[PDB]
Amino acid sequence: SNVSVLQQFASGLKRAKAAKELQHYVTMELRSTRFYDQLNHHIFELERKGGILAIASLIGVEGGNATRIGRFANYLRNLLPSNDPVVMEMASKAIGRLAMAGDTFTAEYVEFEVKRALEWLEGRRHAAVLVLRELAISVPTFFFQQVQPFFDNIFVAVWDPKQAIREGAV
């Protein structure tokens, strides 16, 4: 059980990734937890696409209410610190999908992310706009708590000397 999952995670991390995620989601729903968490943490720490895909595939299938949300919050902030390549940008989508599950700590995570994104707002301002957009798309209600600070931060980031930074802010 755990041996197959560990082998599949490594192969997907390094259509192979899509096939592994689909098989893992079906196997997890049909059916241990500690082995999956350790394998996911190693993949996320190391690679980047496989770890986020495995977490996203496991999200909404295992049924984590608060325990899984808290663990993913620490990993979400790790990828937010650095604006990695376009392949690793899927981490924000996985975080947004998890935050849209409707958990008790989802509102707290959204509020914390919004405050963190305001400070970040070009490896910081551009990534914050994409992160804020992902949070806003998943939770439009939570994105209206502080819209005035976001508008002021977006205006300053839009004037930065870049090309794709303004596209994300717009």
Rounded Cα distance between 16 and 98, Å, is 23
Instruction: Return the ∠ at Cα 105 (arms to 39 and 94), rounded to 5°.
Output: 45
> Solved how?
cryo-EM
> Do residues 60 and 18 make contact, with C-beta atoms less than 8 angstroms apart?
no
Euclidean distance between CA atoms 135 and 140, whole angstroms: 8
Rounded Cα distance between 31 and 63, Å, is 12
* Distance, CA of 41 to CA of 76 (rounded, Å): 12
At 140, give phi and psi (nearest 5°).
-60, -35
Question: Which residue in 30, 119, 16, 110 sits closest to 69, CA to CA?
Answer: 110
| CB neighbourhood size of 139 (10 A) | 21
Alpha helices in the chain (DSSP H): 2-13, 16-30, 33-45, 48-58, 67-79, 90-99, 106-120, 125-138, 140-143, 148-158, 164-169
Please name the amino acid found at residue 70: G
Resolution (A): 3.2
